[PDB]
Amino acid sequence: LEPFYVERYSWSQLKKLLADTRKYHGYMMAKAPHDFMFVKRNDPDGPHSDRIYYLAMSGENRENTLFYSEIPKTINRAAVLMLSWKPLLDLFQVGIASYDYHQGSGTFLFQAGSGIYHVKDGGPQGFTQQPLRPNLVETSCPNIRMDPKLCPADPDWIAFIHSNDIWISNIVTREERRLTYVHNELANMEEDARSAGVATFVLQEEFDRYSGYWWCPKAETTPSGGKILRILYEENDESEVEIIHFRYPKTGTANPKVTFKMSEIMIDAEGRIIDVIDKELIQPFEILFEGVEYIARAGWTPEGKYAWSILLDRSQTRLQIVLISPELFIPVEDDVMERQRLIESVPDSVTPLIIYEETTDIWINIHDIFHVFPQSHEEEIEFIFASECKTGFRHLYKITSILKESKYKRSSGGLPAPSDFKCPIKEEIAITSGEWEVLGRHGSNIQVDEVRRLVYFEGTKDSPLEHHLYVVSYVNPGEVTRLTDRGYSHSCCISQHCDFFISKYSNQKNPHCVSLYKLSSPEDDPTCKTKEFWATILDSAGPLPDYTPPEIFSFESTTGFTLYGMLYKPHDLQPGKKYPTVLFIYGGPQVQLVNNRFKGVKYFRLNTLASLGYVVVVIDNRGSCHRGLKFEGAFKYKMGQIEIDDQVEGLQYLASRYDFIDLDRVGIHGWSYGGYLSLMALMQRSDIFRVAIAGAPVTLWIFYDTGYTERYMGHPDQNEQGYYLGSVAMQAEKFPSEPNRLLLLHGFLDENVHFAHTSILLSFLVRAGKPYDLQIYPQPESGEHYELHLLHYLQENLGSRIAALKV
Amino acid sequence: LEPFYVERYSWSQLKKLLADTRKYHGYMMAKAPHDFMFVKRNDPDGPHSDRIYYLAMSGENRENTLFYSEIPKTINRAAVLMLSWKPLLDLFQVGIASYDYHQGSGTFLFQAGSGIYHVKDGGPQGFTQQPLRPNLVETSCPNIRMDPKLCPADPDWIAFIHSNDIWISNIVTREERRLTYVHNELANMEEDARSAGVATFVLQEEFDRYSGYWWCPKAETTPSGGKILRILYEENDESEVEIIHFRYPKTGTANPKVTFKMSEIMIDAEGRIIDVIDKELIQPFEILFEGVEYIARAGWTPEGKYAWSILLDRSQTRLQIVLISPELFIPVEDDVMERQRLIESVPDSVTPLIIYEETTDIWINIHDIFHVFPQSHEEEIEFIFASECKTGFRHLYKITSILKESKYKRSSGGLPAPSDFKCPIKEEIAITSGEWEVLGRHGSNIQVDEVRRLVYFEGTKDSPLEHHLYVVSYVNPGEVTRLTDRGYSHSCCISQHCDFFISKYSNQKNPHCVSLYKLSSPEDDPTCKTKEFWATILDSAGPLPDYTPPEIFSFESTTGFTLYGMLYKPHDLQPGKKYPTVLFIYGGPQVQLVNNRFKGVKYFRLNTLASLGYVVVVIDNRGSCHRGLKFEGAFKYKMGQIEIDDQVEGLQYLASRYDFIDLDRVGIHGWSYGGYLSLMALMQRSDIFRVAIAGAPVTLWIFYDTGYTERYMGHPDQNEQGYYLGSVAMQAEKFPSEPNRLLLLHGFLDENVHFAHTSILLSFLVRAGKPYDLQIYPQPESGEHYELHLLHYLQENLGSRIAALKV
Ligand SMILES: *C(=O)C(CC)(CC)C(=O)Nc1cc(CN2CCN(Cc3ccc(Br)cc3)CC2)cc(CN2CCN(Cc3ccc(Br)cc3)CC2)c1
Ligand SMILES: *C(=O)C(CC)(CC)C(=O)Nc1cc(CN2CCN(Cc3ccc(Br)cc3)CC2)cc(CN2CCN(Cc3ccc(Br)cc3)CC2)c1
Ligand SMILES: [Cl-]
Ligand SMILES: [Cl-]
Ligand code: NA
Ligand code: NA
């Protein structure tokens, strides 16, 4: 077996090769249709049953905007119907990321650039046949308005954030009122570190929560003829949180001081504000919710009788679903005389209600699944929730909880015990089960059909390489019925009326498609669900000829799990020759790289590496996503210690199976946790790995945030050895004494993994007498430079003939 | 002619080679004896005429401290007397950079670490024969005290800076009093940006002025029996000066707002403070000193009748020597009623006195030469000054100026004209002349013998490669007499009594020596000066065998100047072979690299390069030091444009003269302006230069300070093209498209040439699609890493066989 050497291109020739083969900019295709919504026409004489609204990007150099399409009552089943995209909005006098809608009025609300706009379609006023003009919500606010939301109780009112405070605005009367006076934009960021209605850094970055306020969905009527609207909101104080060059709670240090507040808004009979009463909790947040760090999720019950909240402790091993009555809130009064009367006036029976609680030795994984049924009995609440805590796989559970009067009484003048607010669980039926998970993140949710008493959900039952749509009953659970076709992975939106679903689907060979599917039952059994192809929304471009996709492989690991991987064979594969191998890696939690999805957009350059004569390998090691909580928990307290074993094991599996892998010329490369592991690979296994290109590596776990690090590694005092061994900066001495094996890539203004990680690693590498190569990216045309430098670095120090002579 | 290839050592082998050959740490030898002072014994029966005091480092791992040595009345001229070093101070209960002394009391004052200390020797109390105990000046000041100075009028009092304010302290009574209340350490650096008695950044960095206050050398007696002491001081406001991550006035932006203040200190008959009156100028600084940016130098006349100051304009093309009477200062009064009486009470004849003024089209070069003779007539002042403005070479001039009453009268209530304070010049004799300069920087000054009416000075008369001591009359100037021996460069201290001088001397082959020389006249002519070797103070270690020094060469440049250089021939020079060449460069103003001095300490690694088989070249291009103002002015408004022409010219001179220079493998390398020029070399002349290693390069002249940039390049608006063409960051497109030719080295916390220069160059290189290599030094063991990486980089991309195959 002779070694294959890649063609030694010049820097200009590589720049040319990259530019000629490039087809997407910023690793981004035009946004496929998303954020679907079905509205019924209700026109017996007309040809259409529904109108669907959705956000999409019409072309490559185009802005994301609202379109609609017509769903016909019948179809020509010999033909294939391609639904035409009708633009909902007219061109402006600036792209839309999301939108709101109020079923009963037709009112859309959305932000596009600086403006907040609205239109009407599909309410009482009917359905347009031409693009509507977006109506600007006018303002006297100087700065950009963020996070607009329609009030579901009254579609004339909206709320939004401006300079970290909550405002409301009427789109008909033009009235505009500030609700919170927590932040003062004249005062500096060190003194005034408070905010209302806004999720702080860790909650956005690590818990995927981007909003901090929620409208009450119903309006309390007043005797006068007017009403009371309500906004539940989070209020954060970040004074004690560490500063960096904004507020970044690094692991071990303080998180924000948080609480719930409520804004009570009296409107008169003609939509004019009478008064605004800002209301705080009756007792402090620390007393009523013992041991809670993070407000993970929040909202209201369907009838708006209670506010709900999913709450976590600092260790992220205890979740609590807690109902909060509006009566727990009293007006803010710095006068202690009036305040004391308000505390005593609120009943003792009015108390927080912990309707659910769960624990784990691994960690809680927050998701977006939580459905509350209409309240039939006064002293019971019925909901569906998902959890990994019973069986180690995320499954749906229907839970009924009893709303007891609490044993703790506030009149006694003491503090409540740890479990005085715990509601008894009457019932707890398992809706799904097995060695597979329900998906509750990244758009995956559930659609509950309350009529037929079913629940649609996404899951990994057929395969961990494919997401599929399933349906099952929630009263008499049993037969789980797959609705999506095997051989693709699916991301699905189900109509609110539960008679259609859309699926965005792909596999390794075929690009993304979006298609509409009609749902129906057989006449003999309404429980049984079948689907029929109705129409195409987005048609695939087809298997483009210049991308050769990889093969999914697997191997039985000595760890006792099947580990999956991807293999890009070199193009023009020569007989009796061995090729240099690049291992692309991420390897951290909450990500799966290996599945039956199209990888020719984001990872197109793994194919480009294969075209030059590199074997490219990717392996989902233990800790990675979609394999259950036990598989994920493998590296608890042990980050860095187990990942490379699985990579090396999978690499040796391929070497014995394929003679064309040259194990003497193996490189490794990743970004973020991938960069971290690329450093760990060269440190621990320099026998295996010739070169490591670490992009934006975590080098020091004490420099990363609370929400992420503490979930997987705990508090630093309780894991002194894990933090030391897991931090590559502390082990600089263990890097190679050869140069041309280590390359560090990092941006200067990266606010996720700070440059500090790279610079402190550089600091200790220099003190340890070790060589490194470095590229920096200070503050479009630089993804070009990165790709260029990477090909050149691999060529010069791994792939080419010159590289072998260099050692 | 076959190419020689350097031995390809591994990274570990290079680290070993560097460690084995290393003999100094941080490019620093132990400090040779400096800051000399001669005190007469005045003991007719005893064997010694003088005691000399001086600062020195006794060994390598040792602190800089005060020693003394005994100068005998006679010597054994057959033998060579090596003076023993006697320690002046005892070990403490922490090194000394400088000291003060009060002739008439014996009082030394010095800072060592945090403490300010004092001892006595050589006054009325006599001469110790054993180490004295340093006496701590006690304090209630919390923070470190800076810049201590004895009051020459009263050796009981000192002054010092504490938290940017001037304090005084009595070393006998222990009284301690704050004089200025300008800075408040509780208030932050953005709000309170004021300071007193302290030179701001640009004055320290670019004008070598480190102090901002000066004691009046005489004490005004009061009727009571007490007296008045005076401190002239600079007061700076840096509010409008730009901030960076301290106050850095970048070119084009505002410098500090400056003025003169005076502290008047009434002491009673027993050394106790009665009162302290803080006094400001009668009219603003901007009115009295029209067009002055920088207070370059300041002090007092010998009798203390006037304060003096050397003042510059923003362009640094107009110097003014200005006398300032204490009567120009009035007490500070925010009450306008009392203030108005004080303004009218001061006479109109009391006015600033511009005793000298000069201009140039090139630039003024500040120096430390300024001697004022005792005032014989009431309306005349007599002084020696040095200047390049008459002839383009720095020469000494004796000037007599007439102290006129000013035509401008303050009672009129108008502002003064541009030239109303100009004093008529009665006389202006040239003391020296020719195509050579007097030296007035870096310790070089003049010693004026007022008895014999001579002046000792350092100069370049015998050679621009050697500094020498000369003497000449200042009444009847003529025969300039060299006192130092040819074949060495000399740095000299002359005794205050003008009967001895010490010289620290070296040449290319022999390390530094320090020797004492006795001065005397022939009996027939007191004007004629001769010298005799008296004793050795520091003996040279001798030509150490592992350093081969370079040869000084020269060549007649087409520019019309003789340009000098240094050549390190490769060791073990083989016949009929050509060697790779490294050009070491600085090339900026105010530096000369090429002279007859020992280069085996600071530039020892140029020899180490020669030992591996590199030709090392150094060339003093136009703009560099010690060749006159015309030679220096060559690159005015044109930095970057002319330097590399001279380097390439000198390189081609050597190539035609020596066949062993391989012009196909020429590298360039420098730090600071050298790094800047290394970038300019690869940009302009990639035909000549294969590789460029730029250390801490200036890449953008608008990012550098006012004092330096504007002196050589003017204000950016008046030189738009020079700034653009001189800034390498703006011309990233002109760098090579080949990799392995450009290497950038920069510290992260460099506060002279900021990292910003490198990062913005990196920014534009990435946008231009250009390759670079980078090493960073974030925040002893790293000069090791730099040297290691440089040898390896030259080896891999210039010197070795692998480097030639790589292209
Ligand atoms: C990790 O999670 C983070 C996101 C938080 C970093 C902490 C991450 O994913 N980073 C990441 C970085 C890059 C590199 N780009 C960063 C931005 N930079 C902009 C810029 C602007 C101005 C200047 Br002067 C310089 C730079 C451009 C560079 C890229 C990616 C995306 N992945 C890269 C790897 N890729 C596979 C692959 C493999 C081989 C080759 Br050749 C090409 C691609 C998958 C996507 C993420
Ligand atoms: C230019 O004027 C400046 C001073 C203001 C820079 C703007 C300059 O002279 N710089 C300069 C830098 C170095 C390099 N050292 C910088 C400090 N650094 C400390 C450090 C601490 C912690 C860490 Br983690 C990293 C780094 C160490 C590196 C050196 C010098 C001195 N000259 C170097 C060149 N030398 C000749 C020479 C030639 C070849 C070889 Br091999 C070795 C030496 C002359 C002295 C100045
Ligand atoms: Cl079941
Ligand atoms: Cl003369
Ligand atoms: Na996120
Ligand atoms: Na200086």
Swiss-Prot record, chains A, B:
Activity: how regulated: Inhibited by zinc. Inhibited by the serine proteinase inhibitor 4-(2-aminoethyl)benzenesulphonyl fluoride (AEBSF), and by di-isopropylfluorophosphate. Specifically inhibited by isoindoline derivatives. Inhibited by Val-boroPro (Talabostat, PT-100), a non-selective inhibitor, which triggers pyroptosis in monocytes and macrophages.
Reactions catalysed: Release of an N-terminal dipeptide, Xaa-Yaa-|-Zaa-, from a polypeptide, preferentially when Yaa is Pro, provided Zaa is neither Pro nor hydroxyproline
Keywords (A to Z) from UniProt: Aminopeptidase, Apoptosis, Cytoplasm, Hydrolase, Protease, Serine protease
GO biological process per UniProt: apoptotic process; immune response; negative regulation of programmed cell death; proteolysis
A family per Pfam: Dpp_8_9_N
GO molecular function ontology, one term from the record: aminopeptidase activity
Keyword Protease: yes
Mitochondrion as UniProt keyword: no
Primary role: Dipeptidyl peptidase that cleaves off N-terminal dipeptides from proteins having a Pro or Ala residue at position 2. Acts as a key inhibitor of caspase-1-dependent monocyte and macrophage pyroptosis in resting cells by preventing activation of NLRP1 and CARD8. Sequesters the cleaved C-terminal part of NLRP1 and CARD8, which respectively constitute the active part of the NLRP1 and CARD8 inflammasomes, in a ternary complex, thereby preventing their oligomerization and activation.
Protein's UniProt name: Dipeptidyl peptidase 8
Quaternary assembly: Homodimer. Forms a ternary complex with NLRP1, composed of a DPP8 homodimer, one full-length NLRP1 protein, and one cleaved C-terminus of NLRP1 (NACHT, LRR and PYD domains-containing protein 1, C-terminus). Forms a ternary complex with CARD8, composed of a DPP8 homodimer, one full-length NLRP1 protein, and one cleaved C-terminus of CARD8 (Caspase recruitment domain-containing protein 8, C-terminus). In the ternary complex, only one subunit of the DPP8 homodimer is bound to NLRP1 or CARD8.
Location of the protein in the cell: Cytoplasm
Consequence of substituting residue 205 to K: 13-fold reduction in affinity for Ala-Pro-AFC; no effect on subcellular location
Tissue and organ distribution: Ubiquitously expressed, with highest levels in testis, placenta, prostate, muscle and brain.
Domain of life (superkingdom): Eukaryota
Main enzyme class: hydrolase
